[PDB]
Every structure is written in C-alpha cells, then in structure tokens.
C-alpha cells in the first residue's frame, strides 16, 4: 500500500483477499460498500459554510471554540471565558467546521479506502469531490492554517488550546494518496493538494502556534506529531518521518511516561482514563505511519530507555475493568476504544494477551464507524 494513515498490513490483506475472491472478505467489503453509498451522494462540505466570521473576516479560515471554555456568569458580557476541565461547552456546536471536519474526514477516508480495496472508480470520483472542495478549491477550500482553532473568548494571547482538531482532515489528506492513479484524480488535482499540504506543513512547523504545539508537554505534543506525520507521509518525506520520530516523538514518550508506566500529565485531568488513552491513540496513529518505514514506536526506547509499551502495560487492567480506575474520570470511559488500541499495540509487541483481549472486546461486524473499516480481524 502507498504510505498513509492506516494499518497498511490490514489494508493489504483486505485487498489481497478481496481480489482473490475470498468469501469472508468479499462479504465484509460488500457490507462496507453499502455503508459507503451515503458518501457518494453526500454534498461536499466546506469550512466557508459559516455566518460568524473569525477575526480575519475570512470564511476560509477554520475556527472553533476551545471545548472546555464557558461564559462566566459573573461578568456582564461573560468575558473572559473560564475553563471547566472535561465539561464540553455546547457552544462548540455553533462553529460548523467542528462537526463538518469530522463528516468530511469520515467520507473521504471511507471512500479512499474502498477505492484502494476494490479498484472501483466510483469511490475515487466521490473521494476526489470531497478533497477538492475541502482543501484546494479557490473559494471553498480552507486556508492551510489553524490560526483560529480552539479560540478562547476574552483571551489576551495567541492560539487558545491547540489545533489537535486537525487530525480529522489530515487523515483525509493522507488517504488522497490512495486515489492517485485513478482517472478522477488528475495530475493538476494532485499538484494543488501537494501545494496545500506543503503550505500547511510550513505553517505547522514555523508559525508561533505550530512551534508551541510541537513542544506541548502532554497528549497535544504527541497528536501534533501524529498530524505532522500524516502531512509528511502525504508529501513522501520519509526522512523527515524518521527525524520527527527520533527527535520529537521518542523524547516526548520518554518525558511523558513515568517510571511506573503512568502518564502523569493525563492523570491530572478530570477525564484521566480518557486522556491516558488519547495519548496512546496519538502514538498508535503515529506508529501506523512509522512502522511502514521500519520504526516501531511501541517498542523503540527513548534515550532514557522508556518504551510506549510500558504505558499500555499500566492501563491494560483498567481496559479489562474500568471501574478499578482510581483517578478522576467525571464521564464514562468507552471500553470499545481499547479494541483497536490493544490490537495495534499487541501486534506491534507480540503480546498475544493484548490481541486476545482486543478481540474479546471486539467491534460490531456491521458498524458504520469508518475508523474500524480495516479491522475485520476484530469483527
């Protein structure tokens, strides 16, 4: 498979078996094709579909509200907003790109994977329609920056809470590699998307906000690099992937994992089990890319000898029984997330107990959750 943001092993297996005509896979892919129909007819979304404009007055600038920031009832204007860790302010849904980036990302990802597996042009044609409108269209495409993501009303500073929201559309950017070679994705379409990705990577690496996120001391630093690797892998920058892994990701794991395997920066949050899992999910998506060039992030030590497998080790009992979690978790933790996580970590580490537990937890065979498309092995 081309370099991209997916388990390449599971994708190649699926395509081989689908092409061999194996019945188990062929039936599963035919179900995936019925799931994918809604995306062929889905009208492409655009970041410009908003009324309240960002400070730039540019509808092509992505803008969202940092989710845990709320109006202060004790101020006449509600300003400045105050933080309530773990309590999502429903005002986030007043920024249409928040949910529309998810819907775009799901549609592009599903269609691109189904094109890779089946070879059917109809999936590339529709995948391409979503990509052009979201990224490159000169009036509907988003500007390649995240300047106004997670803004905090009343804040007298830049940024606000990061740009971790980028993972939604950067996974879609990566799957565009899968439709290269189709008749619907022209050489001109690719150049424009290449040029967008180069400008977004530049912003990510050189803007003050991009620099700050690259140095974040918690799961935001790891998700920054997962996103960074998706953009670099899209641009075929395999040497930069090695450099980012060795000079940024691994040191971050070495600083963020304690000697007992816990993630103390996530243990202080009101959703401590969710955010510990979120940190490892960043490493999981980063690993999907690095392992395609020979770097295993679950087992490769940092300079201090710490390995990401120690953090999985620490959490595994709590994936079996979340009720035993002894740190603040003000909302229920979804055990289903441990399925893909323990399978990804288990296969990377040769831990068959992890793989067993992933399959016992499992995923629903008929689920339309697009991230689970490669994981028939769990279904």
Interface with its own copies: number of residues (CB under 8 A): 21
**Integer Cα distance of 39 and 35 in angstroms:** 8
35 binds its own copies (CB under 8 A): yes
CB nearer to its own copies: pick between 229 and 271: 271
87 binds its own copies (CB under 8 A): yes
Residue 105 CB, nearest approach to its own copies (Å) = 16
Could you give the 3-state DSSP secondary structure of residue 283? helix
Site string for its own copies, 321-350 (x = CB under 8 A): ---------xxx------------------
Candidate list 74, 206, 247, 321; residue touching its own copies; CB under 8 A = 74
**CB–CB of 111/39 below 8 Å?**
yes
- Of 59-67, 224-232, 246-254, 362-370, which segment contacts its own copies by CB under 8 A? 362-370
- Selected from 21, 23, 24, 73, the binder of its own copies by CB under 8 A is 73
Residue in 58, 368, 371, 377 binding its own copies, rule: CB under 8 A: 368
Within 93-132, which residues bind its own copies (CB under 8 A)? Answer: 93-94, 99
Query: Based on CB atoms, which residue is closest to its own copies, 73 or 206?
Result: 73
d(CA 291, CA 307): 15
- Told to check if 43 binds its own copies by CB under 8 A, we report no
Dump strand ranges (E) for the chain.
63-65, 69-70, 82-83, 148-151
Q: In angstroms, what is the minimal distance from the CB of 4 to its own copies?
A: 24
Minimum CB–partner distance for residue 270 and its own copies (Å): 9
Q: Which residues contact 37 (CB under 8 A, 6 or more apart)?
A: none
CA torsion sign, 307 to 275 to 364 to 5?
Answer: negative
Asked if 286 and 228 touch (Cβ cutoff 8 Å), the reply is no
- Using CB under 8 A as the binding rule, whether residue 369 contacts its own copies is answered as yes
Contact stretch for its own copies (CB under 8 A) within 61-69, 89-97, 171-179, 188-196 = 89-97
- 238 or 367, CB closer to its own copies? 367
3-state secondary structure of 375: coil
CB 89 within 8 A of CB 65: yes
Handedness of CA 98, 141, 40, 369 (dihedral sign): negative
Q: Indicate the Cα dihedral angle 313, 267, 64, 224, nearest 10°.
A: -50
Q: Check if the beta carbon of residue 196 is closer than 8 Å to that of residue 136.
A: yes
- Give yes or no for a contact between 131 and 176, defined as CB atoms under 8 angstroms apart: yes
Nearer to its own copies, 85 or 239 (CB): 85
Counting contacts by CB under 8 A, is residue 303 touching its own copies? Answer: no
CA–CA distance, 8 with 78 (Å, rounded to integer): 48
What is the rounded CA–CA span in Å between residue 108 and residue 169? 9
Cis bond before residue 110 (omega within 30° of 0): no
CB of residue 310 to its own copies, shortest distance in Å: 30
Nearer Cβ to its own copies (75/183): 75
**String of contacts with its own copies for each residue 254-293, x by CB under 8 A:** ----------------------------------------
CA distance 22 to 29: 11
Distance of CA 109 to the CA centre of its chain: 11
Q: Which is nearer to its own copies, 90 or 305 (CB)?
A: 90
**Shortest distance (Å) from residue 291 CB to its own copies:** 28
Q: Could you tell me the smallest distance in angstroms from the CB atom of residue 268 to its own copies?
A: 17
Chain residues binding its own copies by CB under 8 A are 34-35, 73-76, 78, 87, 90, 93-94, 99, 330-332, 364-369
């Amino acid at each position: 498979a081309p370099l991209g943001p997916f388990n390449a092993t599971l994708l190649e297996q699926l395509k081989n078996d689908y092409q061999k005509g194996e019945k188990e896979v062929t039936r599963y892919i035919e179900l995936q094709e019925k799931v994918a129909e809604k995306y062929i007819k889905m009208t492409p979304l655009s970041v410009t579909a908003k009324k309240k404009l960002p400070p730039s007055k540019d509808p092509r600038d992505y803008m969202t509200l940092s989710p845990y920031w709320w109006p202060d009832s004790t101020k006449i204007d509600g300003l400045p907003y105050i933080r309530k860790d773990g309590e999502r302010n429903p005002e986030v849904y007043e920024y249409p790109e928040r949910e529309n980036a998810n819907r775009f990302g799901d549609a592009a990802y599903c269609l691109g994977v189904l094109y890779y597996i089946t070879g059917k042009e109809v999936y590339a044609k529709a995948c391409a329609n979503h990509l052009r409108t979201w990224f490159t269209d000169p009036k509907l495409g988003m500007n390649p920056n995240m300047t106004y993501a997670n803004a905090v009303p009343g804040m007298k500073k830049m940024r606000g809470s990061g740009f971790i929201d980028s993972r939604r559309f950067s996974r879609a950017l990566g799957v565009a590699k899968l439709i290269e070679g189709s008749k619907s994705w022209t050489p001109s379409d690719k150049k424009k998307l290449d040029d967008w990705a180069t400008a977004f990577c530049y912003w990510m690496e050189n803007s003050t906000q991009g620099q700050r996120e690259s140095h974040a001391a918690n799961n935001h630093g790891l998700w920054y690099e997962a996103i960074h690797l998706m953009v670099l892998a899209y641009l075929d920058r395999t040497d930069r992937i090695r450099e980012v892994a060795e000079q940024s990701i691994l040191p971050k794991m070495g600083a963020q994992i304690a000697d007992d395997g816990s993630l103390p920066q996530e243990l202080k949050r009101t959703l401590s089990l969710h955010y510990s899992t979120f940190a490892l999910e960043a490493l999981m998506e980063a690993n999907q890319i690095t392992s395609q060039i020979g770097i295993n992030l679950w087992s490769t030590p940092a300079s201090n000898g710490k390995v990401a497998s120690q953090a999985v080790d620490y959490l595994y009992p709590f994936y079996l029984n979340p009720e035993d979690w002894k740190f603040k978790q003000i909302k229920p933790f979804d055990q289903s997330r441990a399925a893909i996580l323990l399978y990804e970590a288990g296969t990377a580490l040769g831990n068959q107990k992890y793989v067993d537990t992933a399959k016992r937890i499992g995923l629903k065979y008929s689920t339309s959750d697009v991230e689970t498309i490669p994981y028939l092995v769990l279904k």
